[PDB]
Amino acid sequence: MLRLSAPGQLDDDLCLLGDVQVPVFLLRLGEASWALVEGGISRDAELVWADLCRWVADPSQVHYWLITHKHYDHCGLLPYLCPRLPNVQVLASERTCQAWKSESAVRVVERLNRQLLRAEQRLPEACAWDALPVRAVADGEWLELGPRHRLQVIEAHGHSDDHVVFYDVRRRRLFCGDALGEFDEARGVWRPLVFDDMEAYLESLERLQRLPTLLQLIPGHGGLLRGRLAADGAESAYTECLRLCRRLLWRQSMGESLDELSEELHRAWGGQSVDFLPGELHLGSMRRMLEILS
Ligand SMILES: C[As](C)(=O)[O-]
Ligand SMILES: [Fe+3]
Ligand SMILES: [Fe+3]
């Protein structure tokens, strides 16, 4: 009752498209206007598209697509659905936009997204990554998407050096991507995802704690959190990061290698993302996190 984990309508203005493991959120801005939030994985294009069209009879009414960060599982749908969305404008940070103009970077994103295709699956036709209708948004920028939707852009680096989150001040609703970590569905706690910069990761969570009380907290994976899970989310994510650090120091101090400890974390936590993150990459991300924290 504190996490909404079924695709479909979540609120009067808000729907979850696709699978809850890598969801795309649909906002109704008006009678003839909509926005998407989060960019998904490429293999989900036809599923997300099918869901979309059952809510939006005219896809030319999809006007904005908000993107938290450049990781392959948060922008993989863009080249494949943007062509079907003639009036969409993609909103993303400056650093996120940069990645889509680099071929070495685009090659990685496309290669990862391809590893996720189902047996015998075919991707739609992709427009050019460097032709996406992007508009760079800045830290603190107010996005007036509609008469009842004003969302603030907030820089939230640490998980990645480009990550931003989008805060609907009216609805107390935060789209937070992976900045709080991965929500542990069985245990109800955040699993830290410190893959770039520990100091920035914690600083972002400090700032996000100072927002007005959250009523809805929407990460990049797992659905919508509400009640105390939203109100306490940023603070709990901070606590869980410090906790992992303290426990890492214990385990290392007893002689456990980063090799064994990363494999242990991989076994403990890889299960939730098995269907959208190759296990070798989850393991490597665990290893990088433990290196950063150490
Ligand atoms: C692919 As990930 C662990 O940054 O959500
Ligand atoms: Fe990520
Ligand atoms: Fe992610």
Numbering used by the authors: 18 to 311
Publication passage describing the model:
The majority of traits controlled by rhl transcription factor RhlR depend on PqsE, a dispensable thioesterase in Pseudomonas Quinolone Signal (PQS) biosynthesis that interferes with RhlR through an enigmatic mechanism likely involving direct interaction of both proteins. Here we show that PqsE and RhlR form a 2:2 protein complex that, together with RhlR agonist N-butanoyl-L-homoserine lactone (C4-HSL), solubilizes RhlR and thereby renders the otherwise insoluble transcription factor active. PqsE is a thioesterase that triggers transcription of the RhlR regulon through a hitherto cryptic mechanism, which we identify here as involving a significant chaperone-like component that enhances the stability of RhlR via protein complex formation.
Interestingly, while the presence of two chains of RhlR was expected since similar transcription factors are homodimeric, PqsE itself was found to be dimeric as well. We, therefore, re-analyzed crystal structures of PqsE in the Protein Data Bank39 and found that PqsE forms similar dimers in all of these entries. After introducing a mutation in the dimer interface (E187R), we could obtain and crystallize a monomeric form of PqsE. The mutation led to strongly reduced production of the PqsE/RhlR-controlled phenazine virulence factor pyocyanin and also weakened the interaction with RhlR significantly, suggesting that dimerization of PqsE is a prerequisite for tight interaction with RhlR. Similar experiments with PqsE-E187R were more difficult to perform due to rapid protein precipitation and yielded an inverse titration curve corresponding to a KD of 13.8 ± 3.9 μM. These α-helices belong to the dimerization motif of PqsE and are unique within the metallo-β-lactamase family.
